[PDB]
Write an enzyme that holds these catalytic residues in place. Structure first.
Site, PDB file in Angstrom:
ATOM      1  N   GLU A   1      34.612  60.617  -5.955  1.00 12.80           N
ATOM      2  CA  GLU A   1      34.177  62.167  -5.477  1.00 12.80           C
ATOM      3  C   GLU A   1      34.750  62.319  -4.143  1.00 12.80           C
ATOM      4  O   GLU A   1      34.349  61.313  -3.162  1.00 12.80           O
ATOM      5  CB  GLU A   1      32.719  63.137  -5.700  1.00 12.80           C
TER       6      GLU A   1
ATOM      7  N   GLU B   1      19.667  62.376  -8.381  1.00 13.74           N
ATOM      8  CA  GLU B   1      21.072  61.677  -8.584  1.00 13.74           C
ATOM      9  C   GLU B   1      21.077  61.812 -10.799  1.00 13.74           C
ATOM     10  O   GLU B   1      21.724  62.298 -11.290  1.00 13.74           O
ATOM     11  CB  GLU B   1      21.487  60.306  -8.904  1.00 13.74           C
TER      12      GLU B   1
HETATM   13 CA   LIG Z   1      34.720  61.190  -1.095  1.00 10.38          CA
HETATM   14 ZN   LIG Z   2      23.866  65.187  -5.254  1.00  9.02          ZN
END
Ligand SMILES: [Ca+2]
Ligand SMILES: [Zn+2]
Length: 859
Positions: A131, A306
């Site tokens: 990410e 999470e």
């Molecule tokens: Ca990142």
């Molecule tokens: Zn998160």
């Protein structure tokens, strides 16, 4: 230089393409060699379709070398390959197949496939972090969240390595020193959530049993073999199972994936990452020493955050990164709901009010504030436009959205949203439409009011009572949102009335009324005739995001009797109001100190049962003393604080969390001779505190305090490091060395932290973490100028992820004076990177607030 994908480019590629499948083969056979190993083999086969035959597009890849690329049987020219432009795809058909053979690079940064060599045993450990858009560092892909696909990953790895990915797999010996790990084809998912963890990790296994039409979920936990002795797997599995029993019931949707592995990984920048079926965590969550219940609570909150993403984020994904705030706010809200609903941390809304809301309010009350939502025109904007306020205010305002809609209605809406968008993408508007249909609310105005604005409304009661103490009239007054455009928001909130319980003499809630509050003033007919009691909270249960103020009788009750409030949440809201008042020059610092310290076993913070509130309030007190108290009173304030904290440490239950918290607060304080003498005796064992576990990390905390006061030095630090010759010991030692109270030592610390790029990152951070100390302010005076002269170059020379700890951690927040503001003013007239300017502005703004508070404290 990987590409800076723009929103418009992503939209163009998503309009043209639909990806079916990726089949990925990774050759990691060389991966367990020494530090000279740079690359791994990466083969990708992509199957995808184009809406326009004959069109052209491109696919992403950040590789050291592209050996081959073949599209529909035609070899493509990769002679001019550059990572910034990826691989062009000319002359697409309706249905396409692309095969790329490449060599990709291992990283030691926050991006891609990270490689670490353990210095204790030489084990080599890998993990991915993708990410936002780093999946392209491992395989060839259309790296944007709205081109979901399935992934079938096969890896050849050194034979002693475990290999974990999103799906379960089959492992076969190759007889060539390696094993081949063939993972099942995943369900459809976004590229940033693809995972790979590989190395000689220690493994623990469990299972969450089949539960009301959710398949059983196989569970694993992984960490470095050298950490395994301290990993409390059984506790982690308990919390994990509690989450999985809770979320499918709250959300009405079974766990979407096949299994769930949680991996503690080395040098992890990101904290925790919700890769589907394969969540990664920083190693600071494996505790080698005794910690209080607060850290276990925080860790559990992260675990459930999470897990919440397996639904919100991974089953249904944002279309573009402008909804990243929402992804995170939702997961945080959901994590705490699950804590309260399913775990032992049933006071977690107290934590959220004390920590998250306070963090939000502290930043959003400054002129340097900005809204939650931001325009995100490209990838780079994610990293600059989203920060601390984004996350803490985002979670806070989402909690309020849940209140306004109604919890049962919100959860019903989520069920529809998950059903409606499963395996695909959705936006904030899609969620809001679901919530509208689930509640009958109009939410068309909500974003504009809450997500696109800055600042806080003050909320406070306007009351009139008869001769019997019963309300004759009751209004909630709302102030204009400030700093910001002065709108009056719409809230759902609760009003709580508190009064003495005859049996106990505690303050207990006698009436609660929930209602919609709008505009400048809102009448509360339900409270007409009700006894006013001793304390009125207009944000009872902490449903909204506001600056709660009290009427004068209620305020006098808070000042006199805060510790008598029975339930932790209203009590924490009272601590938060008092702290907010101190920050905003409405309550003198010395009066906040006096409230916190109290005078007895049953007054002040020493009577507080929630350890997280103790810890937080004690930190706030230390900030009040250094920043907000009139300088002439500070020595007296610190004398009172250190005195009381030694008393509390000595009175506390042996071995208790409260004992340890008081000791740790001493360790960060300005200490007098009596306290220095007691602490030495605790450390060296000549006069131990009964029940205190003086283990490895508590030794370091005590020694660091002694160093800071001149009572211990280089010789003692070297001796301590000799008994804890570990990576963590090394970091602790550096913090101690930076604390040495001499100009030579501060100069060396600054030089190393700011200018030595050979140091590991966590050693750099450790150095910084001992540079400041409230006792040593005079040693730091010349570093105001050093900071402003050097930060531009630091920002240029280091990545912004490497630069931030330095910019934030060395900002001269200690130098509360108009001369510092003037130096900062001038710097701010120059040309500088916007993300840097934001940080400097915020630190400047803190000094201006502090100057105002000091003037108030001497009134
Ligand atoms: Ca990142
Ligand atoms: Zn998160």
């Amino acid at each position: 230089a990987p590409p800076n994908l723009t929103r418009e480019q992503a939209e163009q590629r998503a309009a043209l393409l639909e990806v079916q499948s990726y089949a990925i083969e990774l050759d990691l056979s060389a991966g367990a060699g020494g530090p000279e190993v740079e690359t791994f083999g990466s083969t990708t086969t992509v199957r995808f379709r184009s809406a326009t035959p004959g069109a052209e597009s491109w696919i992403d890849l950040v590789a050291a070398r592209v050996r081959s690329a073949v599209l529909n049987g035609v070899e493509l020219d990769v002679s001019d390959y550059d990572e910034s432009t990826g691989i062009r795809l000319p002359e697409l058909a309706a249905d396409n197949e692309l095969v790329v053979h490449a060599d990709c690079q291992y990283t030691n940064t926050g991006e891609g496939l990270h490689r670490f060599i353990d210095p204790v045993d030489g084990g080599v450990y890998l993990y991915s972090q993708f990410e936002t858009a780093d999946a392209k560092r491992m395989f060839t892909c259309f790296d944007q969240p709205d081109l979901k696909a399935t992934y079938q990953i096969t890896v050849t790895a050194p034979q002693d390595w475990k290999v974990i990915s999103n799906a379960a797999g089959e492992v076969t010996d190759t007889g060539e020193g390696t094993r081949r790990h063939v993972f099942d084809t995943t369900k459809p998912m976004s590229t940033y959530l693809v995972a790979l963890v590989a190395g000689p990790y220690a493994e623990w296994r469990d299972v969450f049993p089949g539960d009301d039409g959710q398949d059983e979920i196989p569970l694993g936990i992984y960490c470095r073999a050298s950490l395994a002795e301290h990993l409390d797997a059984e506790r982690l599995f308990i919390e994990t199972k509690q989450g999985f029993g809770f979320f499918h019931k709250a959300f009405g949707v079974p766990y979407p994936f096949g299994k769930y592995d949680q991996c503690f990984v080395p040098e992890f920048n990101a904290g925790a990452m919700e890769n589907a079926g394969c969540v990664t965590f920083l190693e600071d969550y494996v505790f080698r020493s005794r910690v209080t219940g607060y850290l276990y609570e925080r860790r559990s909150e992260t675990v459930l955050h999470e897990m919440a993403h397996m639904w919100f984020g991974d089953l249904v994904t944002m279309r573009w990164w402008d909804d990243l705030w929402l992804n995170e706010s939702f997961a945080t809200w959901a994590s705490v709901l699950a804590q309260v609903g399913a775990t032992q941390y049933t006071n977690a809304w107290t934590t959220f009010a004390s920590v998250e809301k306070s963090w939000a309010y502290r930043q959003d009350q400054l002129p340097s504030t900005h809204p939650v939502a931001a325009d995100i025109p490209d990838l780079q904007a994610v990293e600059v436009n989203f920060d601390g306020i984004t996350y803490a205010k985002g979670a806070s305002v989402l909690k309020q959205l849940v209140a306004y809609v109604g919890l049962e209605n919100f959860l019903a809406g989520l069920k529809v949203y998950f059903d409606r968008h499963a395996w695909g993408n959705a936006t904030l508007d899609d969620l809001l439409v679901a919530l509208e249909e689930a509640s009958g609310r109009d939410l068309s105005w909500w974003s504009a009011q809450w997500l696109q604005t800055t600042g806080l409304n003050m909320l406070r009661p306007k009351l009139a009572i008869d001769d019997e103490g019963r309300f004759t009239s009751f209004s909630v007054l709302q102030s204009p949102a400030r700093p910001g455009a002065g709108e009056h928001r719409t809230h759902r909130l609760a009003i709580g009335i508190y009064d003495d319980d005859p049996a106990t003499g505690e303050l207990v809630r006698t009436h609660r009324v929930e209602l919609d509050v709008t505009g400048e003033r809102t009448e509360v007919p339900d409270l007409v005739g009700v006894h006013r009691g001793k304390l009125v909270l207009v944000n009872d249960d902490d449903l909204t995001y506001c600056t709660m103020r009290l009427d004068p009788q209620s305020l006098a009750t808070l000042i006199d009797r805060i510790a008598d409030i029975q339930e932790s949440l209203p009590r924490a809201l009272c601590w938060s109001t008092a702290w907010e008042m101190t920050r905003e020059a409405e309550l003198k610092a010395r009066d906040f100190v006096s409230l916190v310290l109290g005078s007895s076993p049953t007054t002040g913070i020493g009577a507080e049962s929630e350890i997280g509130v103790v810890q937080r309030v004690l930190l706030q007190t230390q900030t009040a003393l250094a920043s907000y108290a009139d300088p002439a009173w500070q020595p007296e304030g610190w004398r009172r604080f250190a005195g009381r904290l030694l008393e509390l440490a000595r009175a506390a239950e042996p071995g208790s969390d409260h004992q340890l918290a008081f000791v740790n607060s001493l360790a960060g304080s300005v200490l007098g001779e009596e306290q220095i003498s007691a602490m030495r005796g605790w450390l060296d064992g000549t006069a131990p505190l009964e029940g205190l576990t003086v283990d490895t990390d508590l030794r370091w905390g005590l020694l660091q305090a002694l160093v800071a006061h001149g009572a211990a030095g280089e010789a003692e630090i070297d001796a301590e490091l000799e008994r804890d010759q570990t990576a963590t010991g090394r970091r602790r030692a550096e913090r101690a060395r930076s604390l040495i109270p001499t100009p030579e030592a501060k100069e060396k610390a600054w030089q190393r932290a700011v200018h030595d790029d050979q140091l590991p990152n966590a050693i750099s951070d450790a150095i910084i973490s001992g540079f400041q100390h409230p006792g040593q302010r005079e040693l730091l005076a010349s570093y105001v100028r050093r900071y402003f002269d050097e930060i531009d170059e630091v920002w240029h020379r280091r990545s912004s992820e490497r630069a931030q700890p330095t910019v934030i951690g060395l900002f001269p927040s200690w130098a509360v004076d108009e001369d510092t503001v003037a130096v900062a003013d001038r710097w701010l007239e120059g040309e500088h990177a916007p993300a840097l300017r934001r940080l400097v502005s915020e630190g400047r703004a803190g000094i201006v607030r502090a100057l105002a508070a000091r003037e108030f404290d001497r009134s």
